[PDB]
Scaffold this motif. Structure first.
Motif, PDB file in Angstrom:
ATOM      1  N   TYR A   1     -17.818 -31.180 -14.516  1.00 28.68           N
ATOM      2  CA  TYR A   1     -18.350 -29.833 -14.766  1.00 28.68           C
ATOM      3  C   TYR A   1     -19.392 -29.772 -15.873  1.00 28.68           C
ATOM      4  O   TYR A   1     -19.132 -30.188 -17.007  1.00 28.68           O
ATOM      5  CB  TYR A   1     -17.224 -28.841 -15.032  1.00 28.68           C
ATOM      6  CG  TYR A   1     -16.345 -29.002 -16.252  1.00 28.68           C
ATOM      7  CD1 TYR A   1     -16.647 -28.371 -17.435  1.00 28.68           C
ATOM      8  CD2 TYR A   1     -15.186 -29.749 -16.196  1.00 28.68           C
ATOM      9  CE1 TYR A   1     -15.811 -28.479 -18.530  1.00 28.68           C
ATOM     10  CE2 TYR A   1     -14.359 -29.879 -17.290  1.00 28.68           C
ATOM     11  CZ  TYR A   1     -14.696 -29.262 -18.465  1.00 28.68           C
ATOM     12  OH  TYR A   1     -13.871 -29.395 -19.561  1.00 28.68           O
TER      13      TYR A   1
ATOM     14  N   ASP B   1     -21.788 -22.124 -24.189  1.00 31.44           N
ATOM     15  CA  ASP B   1     -20.602 -22.945 -23.895  1.00 31.44           C
ATOM     16  C   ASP B   1     -19.990 -22.580 -22.533  1.00 31.44           C
ATOM     17  O   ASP B   1     -18.774 -22.447 -22.396  1.00 31.44           O
ATOM     18  CB  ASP B   1     -19.562 -22.859 -25.020  1.00 31.44           C
ATOM     19  CG  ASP B   1     -20.169 -23.096 -26.395  1.00 31.44           C
ATOM     20  OD1 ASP B   1     -21.044 -23.980 -26.515  1.00 31.44           O
ATOM     21  OD2 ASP B   1     -19.770 -22.400 -27.353  1.00 31.44           O
ATOM     22  N   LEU B   2     -20.846 -22.451 -21.514  1.00 28.72           N
ATOM     23  CA  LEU B   2     -20.411 -21.928 -20.210  1.00 28.72           C
ATOM     24  C   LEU B   2     -19.730 -22.947 -19.286  1.00 28.72           C
ATOM     25  O   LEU B   2     -18.520 -22.860 -19.062  1.00 28.72           O
ATOM     26  CB  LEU B   2     -21.606 -21.238 -19.529  1.00 28.72           C
ATOM     27  CG  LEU B   2     -22.866 -21.916 -18.980  1.00 28.72           C
ATOM     28  CD1 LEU B   2     -23.841 -20.847 -18.518  1.00 28.72           C
ATOM     29  CD2 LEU B   2     -23.544 -22.811 -20.004  1.00 28.72           C
ATOM     30  N   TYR B   3     -20.464 -23.918 -18.729  1.00 26.76           N
ATOM     31  CA  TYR B   3     -19.809 -25.026 -18.021  1.00 26.76           C
ATOM     32  C   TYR B   3     -18.838 -24.684 -16.879  1.00 26.76           C
ATOM     33  O   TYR B   3     -17.621 -24.784 -17.063  1.00 26.76           O
ATOM     34  CB  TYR B   3     -19.082 -25.920 -19.026  1.00 26.76           C
ATOM     35  CG  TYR B   3     -19.976 -26.475 -20.110  1.00 26.76           C
ATOM     36  CD1 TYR B   3     -21.279 -26.858 -19.825  1.00 26.76           C
ATOM     37  CD2 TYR B   3     -19.522 -26.622 -21.409  1.00 26.76           C
ATOM     38  CE1 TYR B   3     -22.104 -27.383 -20.794  1.00 26.76           C
ATOM     39  CE2 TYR B   3     -20.346 -27.137 -22.391  1.00 26.76           C
ATOM     40  CZ  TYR B   3     -21.633 -27.520 -22.080  1.00 26.76           C
ATOM     41  OH  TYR B   3     -22.458 -28.039 -23.056  1.00 26.76           O
ATOM     42  N   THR B   4     -19.341 -24.268 -15.712  1.00 26.36           N
ATOM     43  CA  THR B   4     -18.473 -24.064 -14.546  1.00 26.36           C
ATOM     44  C   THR B   4     -17.959 -25.402 -14.013  1.00 26.36           C
ATOM     45  O   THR B   4     -18.698 -26.389 -13.960  1.00 26.36           O
ATOM     46  CB  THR B   4     -19.210 -23.339 -13.414  1.00 26.36           C
ATOM     47  OG1 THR B   4     -20.532 -23.873 -13.284  1.00 26.36           O
ATOM     48  CG2 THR B   4     -19.250 -21.832 -13.633  1.00 26.36           C
ATOM     49  N   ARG B   5     -16.682 -25.427 -13.613  1.00 25.58           N
ATOM     50  CA  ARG B   5     -16.022 -26.656 -13.166  1.00 25.58           C
ATOM     51  C   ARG B   5     -16.145 -26.911 -11.668  1.00 25.58           C
ATOM     52  O   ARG B   5     -16.140 -25.977 -10.862  1.00 25.58           O
ATOM     53  CB  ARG B   5     -14.545 -26.646 -13.566  1.00 25.58           C
ATOM     54  CG  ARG B   5     -13.745 -27.873 -13.154  1.00 25.58           C
ATOM     55  CD  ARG B   5     -12.628 -28.173 -14.159  1.00 25.58           C
ATOM     56  NE  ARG B   5     -11.553 -27.180 -14.182  1.00 25.58           N
ATOM     57  CZ  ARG B   5     -10.712 -26.953 -13.177  1.00 25.58           C
ATOM     58  NH1 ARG B   5     -10.808 -27.648 -12.051  1.00 25.58           N
ATOM     59  NH2 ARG B   5      -9.764 -26.032 -13.298  1.00 25.58           N
TER      60      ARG B   5
ATOM     61  N   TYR C   1     -12.843 -30.328 -23.134  1.00 29.06           N
ATOM     62  CA  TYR C   1     -13.053 -28.905 -22.867  1.00 29.06           C
ATOM     63  C   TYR C   1     -12.249 -28.376 -21.693  1.00 29.06           C
ATOM     64  O   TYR C   1     -12.395 -28.853 -20.564  1.00 29.06           O
ATOM     65  CB  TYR C   1     -14.540 -28.600 -22.720  1.00 29.06           C
ATOM     66  CG  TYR C   1     -15.426 -29.379 -21.776  1.00 29.06           C
ATOM     67  CD1 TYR C   1     -15.726 -30.713 -22.008  1.00 29.06           C
ATOM     68  CD2 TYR C   1     -16.047 -28.752 -20.719  1.00 29.06           C
ATOM     69  CE1 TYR C   1     -16.587 -31.406 -21.173  1.00 29.06           C
ATOM     70  CE2 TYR C   1     -16.926 -29.430 -19.894  1.00 29.06           C
ATOM     71  CZ  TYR C   1     -17.156 -30.758 -20.098  1.00 29.06           C
ATOM     72  OH  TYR C   1     -18.006 -31.432 -19.251  1.00 29.06           O
TER      73      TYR C   1
ATOM     74  N   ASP D   1     -13.839 -19.811 -13.982  1.00 26.29           N
ATOM     75  CA  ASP D   1     -14.976 -20.706 -14.243  1.00 26.29           C
ATOM     76  C   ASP D   1     -15.553 -20.478 -15.644  1.00 26.29           C
ATOM     77  O   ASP D   1     -16.771 -20.444 -15.851  1.00 26.29           O
ATOM     78  CB  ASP D   1     -16.048 -20.579 -13.159  1.00 26.29           C
ATOM     79  CG  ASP D   1     -15.465 -20.681 -11.759  1.00 26.29           C
ATOM     80  OD1 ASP D   1     -14.548 -21.509 -11.536  1.00 26.29           O
ATOM     81  OD2 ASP D   1     -15.928 -19.927 -10.882  1.00 26.29           O
ATOM     82  N   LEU D   2     -14.627 -20.334 -16.597  1.00 28.99           N
ATOM     83  CA  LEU D   2     -14.875 -20.125 -18.026  1.00 28.99           C
ATOM     84  C   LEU D   2     -15.102 -21.398 -18.868  1.00 28.99           C
ATOM     85  O   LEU D   2     -16.224 -21.632 -19.318  1.00 28.99           O
ATOM     86  CB  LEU D   2     -13.779 -19.159 -18.497  1.00 28.99           C
ATOM     87  CG  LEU D   2     -12.270 -19.352 -18.349  1.00 28.99           C
ATOM     88  CD1 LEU D   2     -11.677 -20.534 -18.952  1.00 28.99           C
ATOM     89  CD2 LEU D   2     -11.608 -18.012 -18.755  1.00 28.99           C
ATOM     90  N   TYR D   3     -14.082 -22.226 -19.114  1.00 27.69           N
ATOM     91  CA  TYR D   3     -14.241 -23.619 -19.592  1.00 27.69           C
ATOM     92  C   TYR D   3     -15.135 -23.778 -20.840  1.00 27.69           C
ATOM     93  O   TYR D   3     -16.265 -24.270 -20.766  1.00 27.69           O
ATOM     94  CB  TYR D   3     -14.749 -24.473 -18.432  1.00 27.69           C
ATOM     95  CG  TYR D   3     -13.808 -24.325 -17.266  1.00 27.69           C
ATOM     96  CD1 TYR D   3     -12.432 -24.279 -17.470  1.00 27.69           C
ATOM     97  CD2 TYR D   3     -14.278 -24.113 -15.980  1.00 27.69           C
ATOM     98  CE1 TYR D   3     -11.547 -24.092 -16.408  1.00 27.69           C
ATOM     99  CE2 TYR D   3     -13.399 -23.916 -14.905  1.00 27.69           C
ATOM    100  CZ  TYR D   3     -12.034 -23.913 -15.118  1.00 27.69           C
ATOM    101  OH  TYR D   3     -11.177 -23.724 -14.037  1.00 27.69           O
TER     102      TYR D   3
ATOM    103  N   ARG E   1     -16.253 -25.570 -24.287  1.00 28.96           N
ATOM    104  CA  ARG E   1     -16.306 -26.960 -24.733  1.00 28.96           C
ATOM    105  C   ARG E   1     -15.931 -27.130 -26.205  1.00 28.96           C
ATOM    106  O   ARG E   1     -16.213 -26.273 -27.047  1.00 28.96           O
ATOM    107  CB  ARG E   1     -17.683 -27.583 -24.465  1.00 28.96           C
ATOM    108  CG  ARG E   1     -17.777 -29.048 -24.903  1.00 28.96           C
ATOM    109  CD  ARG E   1     -18.642 -29.914 -23.984  1.00 28.96           C
ATOM    110  NE  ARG E   1     -20.078 -29.645 -24.033  1.00 28.96           N
ATOM    111  CZ  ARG E   1     -20.861 -29.865 -25.087  1.00 28.96           C
ATOM    112  NH1 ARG E   1     -20.364 -30.359 -26.215  1.00 28.96           N
ATOM    113  NH2 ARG E   1     -22.158 -29.598 -25.007  1.00 28.96           N
TER     114      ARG E   1
END
Lengths: 51, 51
Positions: free
Chosen positions: A8, A18-22, B8, B18-20, B22
């Motif tokens: 992700y 610091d968003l980062y969708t998995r 993370y 879909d928050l996640y 880091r």
């Protein structure tokens, strides 16, 4: 083996950081120690044949 | 060695997923291939002493 595997990066979405969708992966898993124990430490067929 | 490091999980933020968020680590890095090449293939002091 093949197991859990989470990948992700950078949702490229909404404007706070610091968003980062998995995303989900199918990843190559290889034990390297449990494998050796199974081969020679658990089962002694290989060993006896080689002897 | 010690290099970057990313840990993370689950911001625990919005009710949509879909928050996640880091977090940053200082992680133990160990090359195991570059290391061996440096020990014996790059510098030949160890090898010559052992011989």
């Amino acid at each position: 083996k093949e197991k859990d595997a989470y990948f992700y990066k950078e949702s490229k979405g909404f404007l706070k950081k610091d968003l980062y969708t998995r995303y989900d992966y199918k990843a190559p898993y290889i034990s390297s120690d449990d494998a050796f124990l199974a081969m020679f430490y658990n089962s002694d067929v290989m060993s006896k044949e080689f002897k």
